[PDB]
Amino acid sequence: ATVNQLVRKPRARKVAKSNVPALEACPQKRGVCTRVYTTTPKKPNSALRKVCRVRLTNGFEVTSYIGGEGHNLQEHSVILIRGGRVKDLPGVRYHTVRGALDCSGVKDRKQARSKYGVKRPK
Amino acid sequence: ELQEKLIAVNRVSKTVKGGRIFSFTALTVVGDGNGRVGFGYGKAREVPAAIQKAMEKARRNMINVALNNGTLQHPVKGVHTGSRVFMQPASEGTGIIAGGAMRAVLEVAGVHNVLAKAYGSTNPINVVRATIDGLENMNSPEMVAAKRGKSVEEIL
């Protein structure tokens, strides 16, 4: 309010919490998958979303989404995860970088391949 | 040779006993490009009727703006209900740097070099109203020197 009041109590900034805490301000993290399974989305949606329970290298155990059509992931499959959530899926806040250490590229893609790690078709 | 342009077409409801009664409302701004500008709301059951009605209501109800070679005379602060608008006489050749409604209003009024910013709300109706009010409340050296009873060269 008044300058006199601000002098005694200056504006205390609004510190922001990161939406992606278990990455420790790092673009991606390597983790070993503990359990692959499927869940159901929230009320507007209806599907079988494929997720996995990843143990990162910092001891954080998070839940990640597995994009694309199908996968080849089971227990003790080291994968790379990146930020970003999936909304209609309460807990998941990470996407597996498809086309990485163990995540094989989703089969038979033709456009937007780079997002799914698919080599150039001959 | 009045230049004219629509800004926003919206859709509204009435919810009569039978059901919803949708209708469209336009908003258009006309101007000569040399000071004379005006705005008309217009509201009908179809988009062509709405725009025609708004253009007819906008040709009438035009104001006069004291201008300085496509530029404002002095910084102005227009205010309407929820929108506060700040306009400033930028130098030549900088173009119209303005928000949504202000862009149309100035481009049809004739201003060609202006810095703008729309604080408060950004609802197109109130922004148009505030911009036209702010331009209306602008003085030129001639009129201010006449008002104060001095010569323009004295005011500079």
């Binding site: - | 002095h74 910084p75 008002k147 001095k150 500079l156």
Partner: protein, 129 residues
Amino acid sequence: SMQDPIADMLTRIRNGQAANKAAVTMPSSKLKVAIANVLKEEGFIEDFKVEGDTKPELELTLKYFQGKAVVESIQRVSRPGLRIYKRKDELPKVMAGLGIAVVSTSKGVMTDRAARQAGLGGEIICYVA
């Protein structure tokens, strides 16, 4: 408690202009007298005049042009709670030099343009547009 007589004078002028009074009156002081003198020299008022000795009363005759008041907007800058001092290189323009700004310099009270020509800044008193 009346802790700003200059702000009170500006408020009186503004309210009188809004209420279409021909003249306003106030308890005088040698600083309000100087401000009113500057205003009369710049044409924002018709004429000022003091009266009385023990408790002098300053009386201003406001100026209208075509039914609309001459003084569009007027406000105090250097409030007692927060003084304002500008050097010679920051003497602010009001309405890009159309309006004036009363500045108290070490050579009296004068308009911003006159102070800039003389080459010395000082305290600000009010923006008169």
